[PDB]
Ligand binder design. Structure first.
Ligand SMILES: NC(=O)c1ccc[n+]([C@@H]2O[C@H](COP(=O)([O-])OP(=O)(O)OC[C@H]3O[C@@H](n4cnc5c(N)ncnc54)[C@H](O)[C@@H]3O)[C@@H](O)[C@H]2O)c1
Ligand SMILES: NC(=O)c1ccc[n+]([C@@H]2O[C@H](COP(=O)([O-])OP(=O)(O)OC[C@H]3O[C@@H](n4cnc5c(N)ncnc54)[C@H](O)[C@@H]3O)[C@@H](O)[C@H]2O)c1
Lengths: 515, 515
């Protein structure tokens, strides 16, 4: 009953149990006067244990994208509060398993004396606990509206009082979460951006380059052509010197990408959109290629300095202005320097926040490694863990497929500890659409066993494989932090005779040793 | 104990319990005389319930790729046999949970009187049952060597007696599994191939085109250039007319791809490799681009006629011959018409076998939909099922990420049955690296609700999202086969103002209604 829906390991009675609530502009002051009710099973006051998670619930409901953020308040229950952690979020299952009345709203029942007597363990009330979200270690608290009347409300922060532009106050606060960490000063970036734009517009070669602008609707291919030369010319400016160095190698940061982005923007911004930050943001947010200007690629935010960020934004701003008359419909005039910059700043902040949050990189846990047309991932989280300290076997499933045409899997490289952790050659195989292919595994240079499929393996649209790696433990001795050669399994795809040195496509699955 | 490792639902006592075993050339006749033993926990005789799965175990152990296939025999146990289905393949877990001696080999213990008395349910012996493989509905039987001595062995098929070339006899037999079904006559294809090659070599314009071959080591870029013109010229031949029509539209079947493939082959075939079928096959099997010649793309085998397959193979054969002197190292002479054709035929057969086997297409069950840089999939099989016939809620997790740079998720389109099956707007959200974004969902034209994220959603390397769709059932009435608008959920990525008509990247997740 209660075992099916309640997580005892994670429930607890606490004195002065505190949590956080994010609220909208206009209510930061009135909410500190008291919590009050402004499916039914879930009608309740919502808080979280994470204040920066609370912050995300503070944006003006009618302008969720660019709107103003209100604040975060701390709500404390005096006395003893019982946090009942739930293993399911289906209310009928909860009411049933907890033997509750299958009719009255779950939350309504949570605030009854009987319910508090039964699962409160002496606490004055009960607050439901649920995981905040997939990919979050935060929890979500669900307070019964009546019991919530006992909450003491204190202010955490009022983003509006910080008097900063856009959602700068909210994002810089959340950034406090990680003290890597992208902790940028947007006031500094906002100011450098304006200065740079100014210096660029008022610039000999740039103004000269502008002269040659067809300054009339031209074809898209000609637009990009002009834009790529403009970009090249603009990057010579002393103000964009660092950006010239940082964007020199990675192809994602090339001029063609800036030009591509610039024309794409100029194309979707009509006059009414441009005269609205919310409308600009919604328009820009669905465009591809924003990574070229943000300097984000290969899993890293490369433009992580106020100086380089401001040069990148100033650069695309100038180009959007050039692109508007060639492939647009409005007066680039303000847009490029006004809402374009305001909207893009906001988007950077959204993406920087994502990378500041703890997340699994490709090939880790059940997160896919996408590369060369292939998609590989550990079938389950348990699969990605190699347990140690016992004599025995273990199996590990790795899912494999390719996007379209049939691509080969040459085999798989596995890290070992010869004697302690070995490949179990008889249980290691790969099934392609069910055809269980046996593998010829051989120890190679450097504590790695290379296993090859006995027959050809190809994956693609409609064709998938399950790589089942079996390992053998010769002793109970725990593998130690030096023992295994590496922390990944390497699935090898096709062979490319590139760099005059033939090599395979490598698809890595990262593991952790435990127990 | 036994509940933890034994699947009662799938175990049974059967009279004359039969199964199949695939064996190597040289043993098809001697194995019919009796089963006899030629980790330890798993030492046993191996059979399966699928004869075409058995067939795959018949290839000459020293030439697993191109070698000769022996046969399949049927092994029958007289009397009553108890098939004990196992829920785990870890022998220590089995011996422990079944209270067996944790020392003696599991299989050794399976052939004891005591063990047969305990779990045989009166049957003369016990055979272990295990799922054959991930992606297979077949089972694997594990016979105790001693008890296996009672088996009656009958012949199913001897591929060698069929007297066909390569592994034609084995693959055409397996093809019998699906009676779509690629059931090709390789003798016919082999014969048409030779005829076509002949007609091409002895052909005015082709011979003329050959004349102009630099016929000496030229650069790779020049090689492809010559090869693309040669290809174009060769496709005009009356013998390759159908192939000219079938390869006209899909870019994967273009001449650049044939030329690319041709030079890639010529590049990896040295003399010793070329004089060995096993070595040729192993060499070719790791090359990319085989889908252009097989005519396989977008999840379908397009070249599915003996006529069109033979034209495709004849065409690449001619080109490999041209590519050898330009970007190779041997005498194209025999290779292109000898082992090249033998090896490629084998590879086609491997891939056709994959597509003949039941498999889940992208976006179905936990199989990923890969498109436009995004990777999306149902978190679990249960998620991909929408259950009906009850009043209540259900949640469905969809995993989302993109390969590299930050790409947007505009929102998600969901099929409904207004009144009966609705979107639960309060529980439907998307978490990006943990940031739980709420969604504005609105009913639109045609029994579809479009939900948009309240704030910008971008995914890419290091950034992932979990789309959690919540549905609401207003009555116990079962959704019927006409009710829901479609069988998929459509996640929308970036917007491309292509075809002068702007559209989003569409990523579909296919579901099934059940219960
Ligand atoms: N806002 C949060 O901190 C928070 C925390 C965890 C989860 N959530 C999630 O967000 C969704 C909606 O929750 P929500 O709280 O933003 O919205 P809600 O739908 O409950 O609306 C209540 C809104 O009115 C405001 N309000 C103003 N004065 C109040 C007062 N005196 N007492 C109580 N509320 C007052 C709240 O701040 C909130 O913005 C939830 O269903 C849950 O998924 C929100
Ligand atoms: N061959 C099959 O039909 C079959 C079926 C299901 C699973 N498997 C799998 O293939 C792996 C190895 O099994 P396997 O059977 O190919 O190889 P094995 O390692 O048990 O080797 C025995 C080989 O010797 C042969 N043999 C010849 N005469 C025999 C005789 N008189 N009695 C018994 N065996 C005789 C068998 O045909 C087989 O080819 C298994 O571990 C399992 O994963 C094989």
């Amino acid at each position: 009953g209660a075992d099916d829906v309640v997580d005892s390991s994670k429930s607890f009675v606490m004195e002065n149990f505190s949590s956080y609530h994010g609220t909208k502009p206009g209510y930061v002051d009135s909410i500190q006067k008291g919590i009050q009710k402004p499916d039914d099973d879930w009608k309740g006051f919502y808080s979280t244990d994470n204040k920066y998670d609370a912050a995300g619930y503070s944006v003006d409901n009618e302008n969720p994208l660019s709107g103003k953020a209100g604040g975060v308040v701390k709500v404390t229950y005096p006395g003893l509060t019982k946090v009942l952690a739930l293993k399911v979020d289906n209310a009928e299952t909860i009411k049933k398993e907890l033997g509750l009345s299958l009719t009255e709203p779950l939350m309504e029942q949570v605030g009854t004396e009987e319910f508090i007597k039964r699962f409160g363990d002496g606490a004055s009330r009960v607050v439901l606990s649920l995981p905040f979200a997939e990919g979050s270690s935060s929890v979500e608290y669900i307070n019964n509206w009546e019991q919530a009347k006992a909450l003491s409300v204190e202010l955490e922060i009022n983003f509006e009082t910080r008097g900063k532009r856009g959602q700068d106050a909210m994002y810089e606060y959340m950034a406090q979460a990680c003290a890597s960490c992208i902790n940028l000063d947007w006031d500094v970036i906002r100011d450098k951006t304006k200065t740079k734009i100014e210096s660029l517009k008022e610039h000999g070669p740039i103004k000269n380059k502008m002269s040659e602008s067809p300054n009339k609707t031209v074809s898209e291919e000609k637009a990009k052509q002009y834009l790529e030369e403009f970009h090249q010319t603009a990057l010579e400016h002393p103000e964009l010197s660092e950006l010239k160095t940082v964007t020199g190698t990675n192809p994602v940061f090339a001029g063609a990408n800036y030009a591509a982005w610039a024309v794409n923007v100029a194309q979707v911004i009509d006059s009414e959109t441009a005269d609205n930050l919310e409308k600009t943001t919604a328009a820009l947010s669905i465009l591809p290629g924003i990574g070229s200007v943000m300097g984000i690629a290969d899993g890293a935010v490369h433009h992580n300095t106020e100086e380089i960020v401001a040069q990148s934004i100033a650069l695309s701003s100038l180009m959007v202005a050039q692109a508007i008359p060639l492939v647009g419909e409005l007066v680039d005039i303000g847009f490029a320097a006004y809402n374009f910059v305001e909207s893009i700043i906001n988007l950077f902040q959204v993406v920087h926040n994502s990378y500041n949050r703890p997340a699994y990189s490709p090939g880790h846990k059940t997160q896919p490694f996408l590369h060369d047309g292939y998609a590989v991932s550990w079938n389950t989280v348990e699969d990605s863990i190699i347990r140690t300290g016992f004599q025995g076997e273990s199996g590990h499933d790795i899912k494999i497929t390719a996007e379209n045409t049939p691509l080969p899997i040459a085999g798989v490289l596995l890290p070992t500890i010869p004697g302690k952790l070995d490949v179990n050659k008889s249980k290691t195989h790969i099934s392609v659409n069910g055809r269980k292919i046996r593998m010829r595994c051989r120890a190679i240079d450097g504590d790695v066993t290379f296993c090859r499929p006995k027959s050809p393996v190809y994956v693609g649209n409609g064709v998938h494989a399950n790589l089942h790696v079996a390992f053998h433990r010769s002793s109970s001795e725990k593998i130690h932090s030096n023992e295994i050669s590496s922390d990944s399994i390497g699935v090898l795809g096709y062979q490319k005779t590139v760099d005059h040195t033939k090599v395979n496509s490598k698809l890595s699955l990262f593991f952790e040793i435990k127990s």
